[PDB]
């Protein structure tokens, strides 16, 4: 029962690890295809916003910093593709909603013969 509590330390880790944004996705591409290596990103990591304590500070201050501490790095369409392919869940497009989509478009094709 130790692994029942030790594997969860990796399961919760890989939630703070997984990519959510387009801005993180581009940099993951820039690693994957050989454009930027580890050494290049460690240079880029030193921002306008580095060397900041975060654990001692009250939440009403950090919730105003974190909103406004986002450096607008350039994106790609190549990254936006994959991040839309990452978020799309299972029940996003079932048989039901496909049949319903055609049921919508048939009604539209009828409404343009009503005139």
């Amino acid at each position: 029962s130790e692994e029942e509590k030790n594997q969860t330390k990796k399961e919760k880790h890989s939630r703070d690890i997984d990519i959510a944004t387009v801005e993180a996705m581009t940099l993951a591409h820039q690693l994957a295809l050989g454009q930027k290596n580890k050494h290049d990103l460690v240079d880029e990591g030193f921002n306008r916003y580095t060397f900041r304590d975060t654990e001692n500070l009250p939440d009403w201050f950090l919730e105003d910093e974190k909103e406004h501490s986002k450096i607008n790095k350039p994106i790609t369409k190549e990254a936006a593709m994959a991040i839309k392919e990452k978020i799309k869940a299972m029940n996003a497009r079932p048989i039901k909603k496909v049949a319903e989509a055609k049921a919508r478009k048939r009604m539209r094709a009828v409404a343009r013969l009503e005139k």
């Binding site: 799309k88 299972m90 029940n91 996003a92 497009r93 079932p94 048989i95």
Partner: peptide, 8 residues
């Protein structure tokens, strides 16, 4: 099944 992504 049939309640998955319909690509599956």
């Amino acid at each position: 099944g049939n309640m998955a992504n319909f690509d599956l």
